[PDB]
Design a protein around this ligand. Structure first.
Ligand code: 2M8
Ligand code: MG
Lengths: 252, 250
């Protein structure tokens, strides 16, 4: 069994700390059950949380492995090997300019904004904001609700894909949480262990995750996606409940 | 006679310079008629156009005089004396953050954006956008259509004023082209010379300028505001025209 989990609003509390899901992760770690973050966050944000690879960043844009992963794949980055699944940020940013032309209205994302500005929009510290700005694949859009339909049509018109992560829309090309999970499972050095995948998530960007795994659990505040298991409380209390009530039984 | 003039689409053609107004200006120089730019542009922007003080920047927020101006006014600042008429940019930005809270929604302006973002927004080059970002009095806002009214209400609730500059909204406190014009005329060395003032402008954004001068001329695309003269062709072709029709014969 492998557990793939979203970070923001699933394994992380409202501020951005792992605290409340610590004992839940403890149990899995003690049972030797691999837990893999699959998140909209950047590699720099993930690293600051102290998390080790493997993990998947930027909505499936990038898969980061340990340098000594027994299956050779991706390119060296000192301590990592990186598998790129999506277009690079620079290319998305260029295609967004074309979209803005079509929409006839500015389309701003993090790349347009100062760290100070990002920090005010997101409630992050200035330093955390600099890390959220260090994007390699996916752009976070800052859109007015009234213009969303127009902007999203302009994205698709120029060949970009969009998704929504809880508070912000994102644009990318080839970044899908499900595709990245599928790749990692195929690169897993123990086929048996990767036979059964569990996926936990809370927003739109997690739908492709729920299709890529064998047991899907929704911990968001809405009602669950079609035929997906749900929990009594959202968030980390949801994560804890799922581990104790859905997973452990299957591991005994 | 003193000539007060907007730069956008008045002296400056669509390209960014002034073709047809060039001889019109040299002529004015010949008869010793002072010309004073009155603009939404920053001092850095105005200097890059190679313009000399006196001039009025940021919609009337600041009056820049030659350091050796015969009338002592303003605070010395290198080769300039500066008369500040408006709240400083940093104070405007602080108030904008209160307005965001009242409005319950983000309010973005140039101060939040990179120069590259500003350039793409305005059609300027990166280096010109850095100059546009060096604001001392007023903020340029990047608002969306449906939230504009909530935001404007919020701005006025926290003590700011707003204007529409043609492309974007602007927020400031105390910046008014008319007030800066009235102040410069009061600080003019030769009072007889400041007695007759002409104003040439684009858009209704120059209506405060039109009110502070004795002869107002509109060279925009729309219909001239009530009580303002108009020209056939807009831009520096209207400046040129207005100068040989209204001015040169004096
Ligand atoms: O879409 C959002 O709601 C979140 C979570 O999905 O992602 C963005 O927003 C987060 C901040 O809330 C950033 O930390 C991420 O890097 C990303 O920019
Ligand atoms: Mg999430």
């Amino acid at each position: 069994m492998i557990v793939f989990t979203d970070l923001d609003g699933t394994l992380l509390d409202e501020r951005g700390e792992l605290g409340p899901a610590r004992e839940a992760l403890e149990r899995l770690r003690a049972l030797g059950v691999p837990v893999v973050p699959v998140t909209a966050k950047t590699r720099k944000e993930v690293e600051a949380l102290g998390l080790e690879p493997p993990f998947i960043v930027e909505n499936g844009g990038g898969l980061y492995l340990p340098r000594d992963w027994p299956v050779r794949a991706g390119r060296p980055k000192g301590g990592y090997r990186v598998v790129s699944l999506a277009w690079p940020y620079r290319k998305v940013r260029a295609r967004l300019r074309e979209a803005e032309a079509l929409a006839g209205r500015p389309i701003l994302g993090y790349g347009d904004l100062t760290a100070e500005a990002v920090a005010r929009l997101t409630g992050l510290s200035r330093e955390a904001a600099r890390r959220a700005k260090a994007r390699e694949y996916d752009e976070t859009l800052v859109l007015c609700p009234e213009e969303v339909e127009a902007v999203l049509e302009a994205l698709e018109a120029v060949g970009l894909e969009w998704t929504h992560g809880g508070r912000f829309y994102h644009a990318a090309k080839g970044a899908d949480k499900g595709r990245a999970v599928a790749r990692l499972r195929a690169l897993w050095p123990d086929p048996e262990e990767a036979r059964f995948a569990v996926g936990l998530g809370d927003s739109l960007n997690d739908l492709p995750l729920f299709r890529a795994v064998d047991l899907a659990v929704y911990v968001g505040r809405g009602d669950p996606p079609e035929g997906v298991l749900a929990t009594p409380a959202p968030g980390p209390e949801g994560f804890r409940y799922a581990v104790e009530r859905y997973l452990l039984p299957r591991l005994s």
